[PDB]
């Protein structure tokens, strides 16, 4: 009797992941008392209006 | 918080800076409704400028 085995394995996981996330804007006045327009002029994020 | 940027505005217009500025040399003030010669002053201060 004889026998013979020759056993493999590869594996290969490769991933990624990328996030681009961008922000911008630009509150404008003219007119009104400067700190109604300080305080209206600041971007809150949460209501741009 | 938009309520300090309101204040700091109000706060502004009684203690502002200087954003825009545009200047003249001090010679121009040496004139002679003031000062004898100043001809000769004016001249001097524009090189010693």
């Known amino acids: ?49 | 918080t938009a309520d300090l940027m309101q204040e700091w505005g109000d706060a502004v217009q009684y203690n502002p800076a200087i954003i825009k500025v545009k200047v003249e040399p001090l010679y121009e003030l040496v004139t002679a409704t003031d000062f004898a010669y100043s001809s000769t002053v004016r001249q001097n201060m524009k090189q010693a400028l």
């Open chain 1, 1 to 49: 009797s004889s026998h013979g085995c020759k056993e493999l394995e590869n594996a290969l996981k490769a991933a990624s992941g990328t996030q681009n996330n961008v922000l911008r804007g630009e509150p404008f006045i003219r007119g009104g008392g400067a700190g109604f327009i300080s305080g209206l002029s600041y971007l809150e994020l949460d209501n741009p209006a």
